[PDB]
Subunit: 388 residues, 4 copies
């Protein structure tokens, strides 16, 4: 109809309720489920769906062998109905590639897939299910993007890309697209020293992205975008409650404009909702691996370098595998505020579970409640032994 | 379009004709059919569908082992086309949880799923396929609901929940929702001493629910709701034709305001159509187990403590497994009256058939006919030996 | 929109072109295809679909054992997209039962399914996908109907039923339905001595049905219905080109008002297009079994007791299995005339191929061409050995 | 809405970006994927889809044995969602046959399938999913057509057919259809000596077809059609960059009106975009077999007998199997020009890989970019060893 405008602020997050869960690995042990990774969720005005990067093979299929690898010509961005698993028969291919993002602007959806060899990748921007724009690699070193939904305001949908090293300074760009066409792009500015896999959400005409500093930071970089002025700023979450993985133990004081040191060249895509006292941070429980997942209310985490938790909710037990996590919201729901939501990728198989030769995942997702709801843990649920 | 109003009375029930049957277990022996239990049927203005609580695994899959358990993080309310089986590929997830209800108000559908650990469950009310309201457990002991469709009148859809003990007094509440929001809730009143899994239907602006007294009664409790005044009453079916399971043998006189004794802490979800002489009761044939199923016309069963059958129809032979049963009607059919319908859950596997390690079911459903139709029996039809 | 009226006459049939073929048995050897029999084809104003009586199990499934049987509680009328096979995942259940008919009146579709034990069957008439009318058995001996599409005119859709003996006189009735309700019914009249499984088509406000006299006739009975006056007549195809199976060898002169003798208590559902010189008869090639299939142009077959073929087209070689055949036409196609179409059921398995324990079929269908097209034969195509 | 008119010219082709890839063989190793060959792509105003000739069996099924054969009664033209594989459950049958073409005219789609024995084949032209016209073989020797999409202009959709010898002169005809009806047909004229499997595209009210001279030419014949005047011309691509397979090595000067000699009675369906300096030719890398695939910019290839490449892009490595290739464009995209697209059939199995008994393929497709994008190679990706 008309382009959606981020006119509402976030609802008060007093807890998280269960939103969707596909139990993909459990079900796929005996049905035609595609092997995936790097999942996310994204809404259209009339439907919300699960998204991920297929590996072009079923879990039980013999081609599942070797799916620990990230980039191949057999990957594609696929979407499927909320809480169903990604099967061969219900999965819709949005585009071909090994890194993606996608978002609805209110009128139609823009999906972006990057493919190519390491030194010669290219992004192709689809709008209304047709290819419209193509961007060639600028640093010739794995052009890559969010791995979660982008956000639009009045037709303008900013997207963060990175090209270059994962263990040194790289070239991050913020592209402002409208109907799949490039209106403008900027180089990253601010104090964030390295940007990877941004998780974004929008409220009151501002887009907040919590990304990942693979190079040096255990605290997360944040990019705040003005989609009207088409400008942005960057910094790090000030809080001592560190949210990358692996990471050192929490200090008593964090860093606002520098990476918090202790772990180099590693991390995991993650997210946060930064809204004054209504601030909640997601993170793996383990400081060593992608294990467990919890949400912590840390009032003013973005700007207060001594902020610590005032409330929390466990999502996945530390005795269960987690993985990537990101933000999304249903911008087309009823009500006066946007309900914060997130998903957690539950990785199974390699490298942690190496008795099998594949790597896949299932999805669990939650949204906020103004109630103070009791908590449950939500594991993948599959028994690896069955796959042997 | 507009909210549906219960303006019609029930059609005269002279017999029952076959409405739907999915043969899920038979078919699932060699196809991707989800393991389920606690099924029901519910209509939208343009389609009627089968509903149930998936176990997040196929019947043939290795994860089917252990599906006798009621509550896990792998369950979800799913719906699928009438008479098809619940497959991985055609099942639509309505919400995540291990206890549910769902009903269309004429404009859109409300679905409710409760999830959580025993002492910390929570309900989330979805409307128009979006989460709108959340209710936290009030007694910290398995918050639970109908397991069959709710009913709406002018946008108001009452739902009965219970939280607390299954073998003592508990806290039952009647919530009146409109567009997924709570307009009001009451504690249970009347003479019903324990309420569980209510089966409801609406006619002439009144909603009748035949539930289950797990604690003491072999006769069924009944809750009659006024959706306009948002008030209700409760009692027991007076008739000596006892309809819970297990149960004692039928006496010559029943009880109108107290549970009829003889069996404690057990039962099965069931239903009835209470309409003066046009009254029909459903029940298992066996007084000891979920075996067989028959419909009995017992004129004035609700108010006459000596009422006995004047007609009957066998639905499932006593040599076949039955299970849960509930009511639903197509409130959007043509004609001057609402045609009473019901379903019977045909449970296969554990605990009765323990050579297999799973528990699932298929569905058979009937609706009333003004004709006096010949009868057939409708068993699940699967051979357990094939699964070995 | 509006009720369809049979305002056109048939197109000139100079040959038959391929219309649809599902290769169900071939495909089902390694995919989830339901076991069926008694198939047909029927069109809606915007789509034409394949129909059949499912056996409630896949071909490869263990429950396929015993599917030679005709009537069980696991059968249902299902429809699926033209030329696809009937799979567990794309098959839509129209109603439950072991004998059926279905037709679109221009506004919506009426489907009829009969179920029950032999001495207590009942038909339930569905309209707009809802049950509207029920008819109880009148002779208590396998109430049964067409097994192919009915035809409508201005909302009136006549249907032929038979109840009683298959090897003696029985009680055949012609019901005139409108919006699923009974406007009227007549007993069969005319000279046809036994009626079973009528195949019908409509043109110029008249409905012609070529049925089967199981009891005595090797020539086929014909019922011509006036859907406006709601009256009919009956006789036999006069031609010596006999079209039932099994049957004696063709004589030089046939019978117009009596069954042509030589074979008792047996036959196969079949059809014909009776249109003066534009007359074409379908029949198995073998006079002994359901083997082969050919179309023969026999000018004035209905009224000329010495009529013989003037042209022909082989559909299935005599070295291939055939089975039931019936008529249908797309009453919503463009043009000035109705294009005659038909299907042939290609039965595989029992009783002819008894190395397997199942009985199923695939479908081949043709429509007429005003051209004189070259001919091909169209067998099922499956290798039974593969199923062993 | 209205008939589409070829009002735009082609966009400038500076490179090719990835458009779609189904990884059918990889996925089909463990899921219900139909065996196919002779694929293509074609767009409707609201969706673009993959098309191919099914073999009426899954790859893993036992009936896959023998699928190297081209024509059987078990083949059919099927279409399915872009980039999904052709499965039993998502494939839509357009018509029955072993040679086809299909195109949308802006209002609805016309699909053509030819079936029959070698000496008695016939084409049936479907429009709006209904059979409208039939054409009988004229030379009684494998009536055949494009194997890729046709193109329409103001309702007129020209189609090229050939009937007769594949190793001598044959009878090629250009049919001009409108709403499935024949407006006119011509015999082939011009200098092309043999025509087979034309690949066509339209721009600025002209339709260009790059076909295949099976008999003598290693250079490709080209037919340019005027859909308004309903006339055409024919010649060969003048360029020395030879594009058939097998073929001799490239000379320094090609032939404009005669087949370039060196290889007789063999070839492969292929295509080209002939647009002055904006000219790009596709071809297998190997001069001996269907191996590899590359796109070469050869300015003025059609008219310049000494034209050589000025740029290029590898699509499939010479160490990977290729096969048929053809053109299509989304005539309903936004923008001022038509974006040239093409697909490459990646054949697996027989005759090159004879350890398996089947022959199938997957699809890769690209469209043009005005950017100068980095290149990747796109192989089928399946491991034949897995199928053993
Ligand atoms: C039914 O449901 C309800 C609803 O969920 C249940 O109630 C919930 O219970 C939760 C668990 O207790 C509770 O969650 C905790 O909240 C704490 C904050 O509240 C307390 O402090 C505030 C502020 O003073 C008070 O207002 C309030 O009254 C409380 O006293 C959080 O602080 C908790 O998180 C910390 O502990 C958990 C382990 O429980 C860690 O995993 C987590 O990371 C936090 O601790 C680490 O990080 C901090 C900050 O740097 C460190 O100081 C600390 O030492 C830890 O550091 C180590 O571990 C991390 C992670 O591994 C590592 O990185 C680091 O290096 C160190 O090694 C926790 O979030 C809910 O708030 C509460 N909800 C409500 C509404 O009440 C109820 O119990 C359920 N009922 C039943 C019967 O079960
Ligand atoms: C073709 O189709 C038609 C249509 O279906 C067939 O006709 C139907 O036939 C049915 C079976 O006969 C018949 O059903 C019965 O109806 C009885 C009522 O009708 C009779 O009584 C009235 C009132 O006097 C008369 O008007 C009428 O003329 C009849 O005489 C019911 O009473 C029957 O139910 C009871 O019996 C069945 C077993 O048949 C039990 O399973 C059932 O539970 C009922 O009996 C128990 O409960 C009562 C009440 O408390 C006890 O008194 C009794 O002892 C039983 O108690 C024991 O068992 C229960 C259950 O296990 C246990 O809990 C308890 O503790 C005890 O142990 C039955 O419903 C249809 O009405 C009739 N329909 C029509 C339209 O005619 C026709 O036969 C078919 N044709 C062919 C050829 O087959
Ligand atoms: C390319 O395609 C075209 C198009 O299809 C091919 O041409 C077609 O060729 C067909 C086969 O020849 C042909 O079909 C036959 O048509 C005959 C009628 O035409 C002839 O007679 C008329 C009338 O005189 C002439 O005008 C005309 O010129 C011809 O001379 C039919 O009579 C044929 O059917 C009979 O024979 C077949 C076997 O071929 C039987 O299966 C069939 O049942 C018919 O015969 C039985 O029944 C009759 C009637 O009672 C008996 O008299 C006779 O003895 C048979 O009876 C026995 O068998 C039956 C069945 O088993 C049994 O019940 C009974 O008891 C007995 O045991 C046949 O239909 C097409 O018309 C023709 N089409 C066109 C447009 O030309 C062309 O050949 C193909 N090209 C190539 C290269 O292959
Ligand atoms: C990142 O991405 C970019 C973008 O893709 C990469 O850059 C691309 O690199 C490509 C590979 O180098 C390049 O493709 C080549 O383009 C050549 C034309 O450009 C050159 O010539 C022009 C004209 O002078 C100059 O303007 C320009 O500056 C260049 O110098 C083509 O000529 C190439 O094709 C020929 O070679 C390939 C092998 O590479 C053959 O397979 C192909 O068939 C062509 O050669 C055969 O045919 C010709 C013509 O008849 C014969 O003369 C020749 O001998 C060959 O003949 C034999 O082989 C054939 C086929 O088997 C057989 O039939 C025959 O009988 C003989 O046996 C090639 O197309 C892109 O244009 C370039 N793109 C851009 C935008 O720059 C970049 O490298 C990537 N980066 C990294 C780090 O990898
Ligand atoms: C989001 O904001 C823009 C205004 O920036 C709205 O766009 C106006 O919409 C009306 C109706 O479409 C037009 O007549 C105005 O000219 C539009 N645009 C501009 C850019 O001025 C848009 O409608 C808003 N979206 C919603 C859902 O309200
Ligand atoms: C059910 O009853 C309510 C009246 O209680 C009907 O609601 C009225 O509908 C008309 C048209 O929508 C409005 O103009 C009235 O104001 C509506 N409501 C009220 C609450 O007064 C409703 O239309 C009835 N439903 C149907 C199907 O007739
Ligand atoms: C089939 O015939 C009936 C007439 O018998 C047509 O019905 C008339 O349709 C118009 C528009 O719906 C009404 O105003 C007339 O009263 C209708 N009916 C009768 C029974 O008189 C019907 O429209 C015809 N169908 C078609 C497709 O033309
Ligand atoms: C393609 O061209 C034809 C003109 O040749 C357009 O057809 C005209 O369309 C308008 C509206 O439908 C009619 O009133 C004219 O009579 C139409 N036709 C002719 C043949 O004169 C057609 O609309 C054009 N297509 C598009 C998409 O613009
Ligand atoms: C305190 C529980 C009382 N109660 C109603 C039961 O135990 C019911 O028993 C039965 C049962 O089949 O008897 C299954 C139900 N299972 C299910 N809905 N998943 C279960 N309810 C819950 C919520 O687990
Ligand atoms: C008294 C029965 C006479 N009759 C028409 C038959 O026996 C038909 O025979 C055949 C048959 O293939 O010959 C199958 C039919 N099977 C089927 N429609 N399920 C069956 N009809 C019924 C209703 O069972
Ligand atoms: Ca890091
Ligand atoms: Ca009880
Ligand atoms: Ca007979
Ligand atoms: Ca050649």
């Amino acid at each position: 109809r008309d382009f959606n405008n981020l006119t509402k602020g976030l609802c008060t997050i007093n807890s998280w309720h269960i939103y969707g869960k596909d139990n993909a690995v459990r079900i796929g042990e005996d049905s035609d489920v595609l092997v995936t990774r790097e999942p996310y969720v994204s809404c259209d005005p009339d439907e919300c769906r699960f998204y991920a990067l297929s590996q072009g093979t079923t879990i039980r299929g013999k081609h599942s062998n070797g799916t620990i690898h990230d980039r191949s010509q057999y990957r594609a961005l696929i979407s499927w109905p909320l809480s169903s698993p990604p099967t061969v028969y219900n999965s819709r291919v949005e585009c071909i590639g090994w890194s993606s993002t996608s978002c609805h602007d209110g009128k139609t959806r823009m999906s972006i897939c990057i493919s190519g060899p390491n030194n010669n990748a290219s992004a192709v921007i689809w709008y209304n299910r047709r290819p419209v724009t193509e961007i060639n690699t600028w640093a010739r070193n794995i052009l890559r993007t969010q791995e979660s939904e982008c956000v639009c305001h009045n037709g303008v949908c900013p997207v963060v890309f990175t090209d270059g090293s994962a263990t040194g300074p790289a070239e991050t760009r913020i592209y402002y697209f409208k109907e799949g066409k490039i209106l403008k792009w900027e180089p990253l500015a601010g104090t964030a020293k390295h940007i990877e896999e941004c998780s974004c959400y929008g409220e009151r005409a501002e887009i907040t992205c919590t990304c990942k500093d693979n190079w040096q930071g255990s605290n997360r970089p944040v990019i705040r975008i003005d989609p009207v002025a088409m400008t942005h700023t960057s910094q790090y979450i000030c809080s001592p409650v560190l949210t990358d993985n692996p990471r050192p133990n929490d200090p008593t004081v964090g860093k606002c404009n520098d990476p918090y040191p202790g772990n180099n060249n590693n991390g995991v895509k993650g997210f946060s909702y930064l809204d004054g006292v209504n601030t909640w941070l997601g993170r793996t429980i383990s400081i060593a691996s992608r294990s467990g997942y919890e949400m912590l209310k840390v009032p003013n985490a973005l700007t207060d370098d001594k902020s610590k938790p005032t409330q929390g909710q466990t999502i996945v037990l530390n005795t269960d595998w987690s993985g990537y996590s990101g933000s999304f919201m249903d911008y087309w729901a009823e009500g006066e505020c946007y309900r914060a939501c997130f998903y957690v990728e539950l990785i199974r198989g390699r490298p942690k579970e190496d008795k099998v030769w594949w790597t896949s995942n299932s999805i669990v997702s939650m949204c906020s409640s103004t109630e103070f709801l009791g908590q449950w843990d939500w594991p993948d649920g599959a028994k690896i032994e069955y796959f042997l």
